[PDB]
C-alpha cells in the first residue's frame, strides 16, 4: 500500500526557522509529484506548491513563493517544506499529497497532516471555571451546566464528565484563540433540573502539553 507519512506537530515562535517532511513508501518516490497544501484553522484548502523528487523540479503558487522553499532528498524518499522566518499567519495544518504532473488525475494519496502553531505564547495549563446551572439556564425540566476551560497553550484539551459516566447531552466546543493568544473552550451538558442539588456533576479537564489535570464540581 502507498503511504505518505508526515513529520510531527510543531510549536514555534515568530521569526524561527522550520522544516517539515513528507516521506513516501510503497512506490517509486522519484516518479510522482509531492504536493503541499495549507489549511488555516477553520478555513479551506490552499495549494502551495509541488516537487518531482527525481529531478528537484518545482512549481510554486505566486502567493507562497519567497516565503517557503520546497525541496526533496531522493536518497531517503523524503520531500520537504521549509521556512526561513515564520509568521503567526503560518499557523495552519499542512498536508502533503502524491500526484501526477499538474495534479492531472487528482491528488490520490494524502499524508496525515502536520499541525504548525506559530505563537509568542509559552506552554500554559488552563484555569477551569464552573458554568453554574440556574433559572437562567433551565427550560422545560432540563438545565444546562458546564465548564469554561480558559487560558491554555498549546492545543489541545480534552473534557469528560463524571470520569466518563456522563456522555449524553454533552457538547464540548472547538477551541477559540483568544485576543491574548491563549486558547479557550467550554464544555456543556443538559441534565434534569430535579437532579441539580442531589446529583454531582464534575468536569474532568486534561491538558497534556503542560501536565495540567483539573476536576471541577459544577453546582447551582
Amino acid at each position: 500500500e502507498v503511504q505518505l507519512v508526515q513529520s510531527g506537530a510543531e510549536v514555534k515562535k515568530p521569526g524561527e526557522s522550520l522544516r517539515i517532511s513528507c516521506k513516501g513508501s510503497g512506490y517509486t518516490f522519484i516518479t510522482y509529484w509531492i504536493e503541499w497544501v495549507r489549511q488555516m484553522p477553520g478555513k479551506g484548502l490552499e495549494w502551495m506548491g509541488d516537487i518531482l523528487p527525481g529531478s528537484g523540479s518545482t512549481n510554486y503558487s505566486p502567493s507562497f513563493q519567497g516565503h517557503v522553499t520546497i525541496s526533496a532528498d531522493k536518497s531517503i524518499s523524503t520531500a520537504y517544506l521549509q521556512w526561513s522566518s515564520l509568521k503567526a499567519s503560518d499557523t495552519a495544518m499542512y498536508y502533503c499529497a502524491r500526484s501526477g504532473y499538474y495534479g492531472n488525475s487528482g491528488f490520490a494519496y494524502w499524508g496525515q497532516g502536520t499541525l504548525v502553531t506559530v505563537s509568542s505564547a509559552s506552554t500554559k495549563g488552563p484555569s477551569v471555571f464552573p458554568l453554574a446551572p440556574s433559572s437562567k439556564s433551565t427550560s422545560g425540566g432540563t438545565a444546562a451546566l458546564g465548564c469554561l476551560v480558559k487560558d491554555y497553550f498549546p492545543e489541545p484539551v480534552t473534557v469528560s464528565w463524571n470520569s466518563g459516566a456522563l456522555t449524553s447531552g454533552v457538547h464540548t466546543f472547538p477551541a477559540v484563540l483568544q485576543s491574548s493568544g491563549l486558547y479557550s473552550l467550554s464544555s456543556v451538558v443538559t441534565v434534569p433540573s430535579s437532579s441539580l442539588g442531589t446529583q454531582t456533576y464534575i468536569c474532568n479537564v486534561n491538558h497534556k502539553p503542560s501536565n495540567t489535570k483539573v476536576d471541577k464540581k459544577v453546582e447551582p
Binding site: E35, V37, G44, L45, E46, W47, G49, D50, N59, Y60, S61, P62, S63, Y95, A97, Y102, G103, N104, S105, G106, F107, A108, W110, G111, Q112, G113, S127, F129, P130, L131, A132, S134, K136, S137, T138, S139, G140, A144, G146, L148, K150, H171, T172, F173, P174, A175, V176, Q178, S179, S184, L185, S186, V188, T190
Partner: protein, 219 residues
Amino acid sequence: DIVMTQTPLSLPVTPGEPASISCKSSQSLLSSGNQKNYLTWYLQKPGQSPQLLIYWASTRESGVPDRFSGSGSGTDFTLKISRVEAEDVGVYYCQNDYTYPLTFGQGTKLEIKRTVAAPSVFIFPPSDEQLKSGTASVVCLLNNFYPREAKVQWKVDNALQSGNSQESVTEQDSKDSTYSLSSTLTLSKADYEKHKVYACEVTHQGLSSPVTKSFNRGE
C-alpha cells in the same frame, strides 16, 4: 490564477435525496490536446485528510461509490451524489488541475437537513472564582438548534458591544443533527462591575422575533 467558485457554500441534504455541487472556473479547463476537462473533486470529512473523488471531471477514483458522478465542460462543472449517505457529510472541494497554480475552490459544506429547531438560550454569569482572579467571562449558550445560521449580539446596559466576544460552534450532532453555539463576552473585573444588565440577543430561523436572554450582575 484560475479562480474556482463553488455554489452553494452550504448544502443541507436529507439522507437519501440527490445532491449537486457546482464549480465555476474563471478560465477553461478543457484541453485542446485530448478534449479532457482537468477538473478534480475532493471530500474532506470532519477531522480527516482530504480524499480524491473524481478526476478529469467525470472519472471516479477507485473505491469511490458509484453514487458520485461528475459532469460539465470548459468552465462549468457539477458533482452529483445520486443518493446521499450520512457518511457523505463534510466539505467538498473542486480543483483546477489544468494549469499551475493548482487552485482549490472555497469549499461546499454538505450537512444533514432536518426540521427547524429554535435554540434553547441560556446565559451564565462569571463564576465567583473567576471574578476573584480579576476577569469576567459571560457565556451565552444556544443549544440544540437547526439550521446552523444564528446571530448573537451582546448588549450591556442596552449598549451594543463589539470586539469583546468570540463564538464557537459544534460540528453537527451525530444523533439529532443539531448545532450548539457559545458566545463568550470577556471583560476585566472592573469593567464588568461598572454595569448592571448583561444581555444576549439571539436571531434564528426557529424564532419568530429576536430573543433576549439577560441577567442583572450580582443576582
